[PDB]
Curated annotation (Swiss-Prot):
Function text: Mediator of local inflammatory process released following cleavage by C5 convertase. Acts by binding to its receptor (C5AR1 or C5AR2), activating G protein-coupled receptor signaling and inducing a variety of responses including intracellular calcium release, contraction of smooth muscle, increased vascular permeability, and histamine release from mast cells and basophilic leukocytes. C5a is also a potent chemokine which stimulates the locomotion of polymorphonuclear leukocytes and directs their migration toward sites of inflammation.
Residue intervals of the Anaphylatoxin-like domain: 24-58
Lineage: Eukaryota, Metazoa, Chordata, Craniata, Vertebrata
UniProt protein name: C5a anaphylatoxin
UniProt source species: Rattus norvegicus (Rat)
Gene this protein is translated from: C5
Cellular compartments annotated: Secreted
S-S bridge residues: C24-C50, C25-C57, C37-C58
Involved in C5AR1 binding: annotated segments: 18-47
Length: 77
């Protein structure tokens, strides 16, 4: 893991009652060098729960990537 990135995303994904929002969580967690979470979620249209899960996991993952950047650490965590 990098800074619990996979642990924290998988923790959130395990909370979802249905497969669509779970998948949208994983989609949100994918890194995108060009767009922030708010820009990306604006393009999601499956439905309300997908939107919320996408944004929740995008926020979790990008906060952790921000922490990783802030730490300036070589290698794994």
């Amino acid at each position: 893991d990098l800074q619990l990135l996979h642990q924290k995303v998988e923790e959130q994904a395990a909370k979802y009652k249905h497969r669509v929002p779970k998948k949208c969580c994983y989609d949100g967690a994918r890194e995108n060098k060009y767009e922030t979470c708010e820009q990306r979620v604006a393009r999601v249209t499956i439905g309300p729960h997908c939107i919320r899960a996408f944004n929740e996991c995008c926020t979790i993952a990008d906060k952790i990537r921000k922490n990783i950047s802030h730490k300036f650490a070589p290698x794994a965590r």
